């Protein structure tokens, strides 16, 4: 939730600075890492209940 | 400037035509159709912008 | 030179913005690719 709010607030930038820079790259990487980890957790908990 | 703004509208029209083709071929697909097969794992992926 | 700038020249020219409303960044490709 914190990461996606960061994405909308940083993406509403004024026109001479709306860039694709080092901040956007690591923000997108962080969002994908979060989704990957909370995909792995479901598999782990199902193996636990089995 | 008039022609450039035209070209922007034409590009939007092209994207919407491609979307119409894909989603119409989705919607009119039926059970007991010919082009159906298993594809495991596309419900796991969600890459949308 | 007054004729060294026209609308047909700065319409071509690239340092000026002339921006649109799309924010997606399309990619280009090379023929061997």
């Amino acid at each position: 939730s914190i990461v996606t709010d960061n994405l909308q607030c940083r993406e509403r930038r004024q026109h001479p600075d709306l860039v694709r820079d080092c901040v956007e790259i690591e923000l997108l990487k962080e969002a994908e890492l979060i989704r990957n980890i909370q995909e792995l957790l479901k598999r782990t908990i199902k193996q636990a209940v089995s | 400037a008039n022609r450039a703004a035209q070209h922007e509208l034409e590009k939007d029209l092209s994207d919407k035509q491609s979307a119409y083709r894909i989603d119409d071929k989705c919607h009119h697909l039926r059970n007991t159709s010919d082009g159906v097969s298993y594809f495991h794992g596309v419900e796991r992926v969600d890459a949308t912008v | 030179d007054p004729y060294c700038t026209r609308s047909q020249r700065v319409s071509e020219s690239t340092m000026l913005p002339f921006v649109s409303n799309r924010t997606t960044l399309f990619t280009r490709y090379t023929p061997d690719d």
Partner: peptide
């Protein structure tokens, strides 16, 4: 060939700028 060199800076398979050879340009 100024725009040819300008496009050829970004001509590889990566995220290129708004550099459309005629017309408008991406905002980002």
């Amino acid at each position: 060939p100024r725009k040819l060199y300008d496009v050829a800076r970004n001509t590889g398979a990566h995220t290129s700028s708004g550099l459309a050879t005629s017309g408008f340009r991406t905002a980002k």
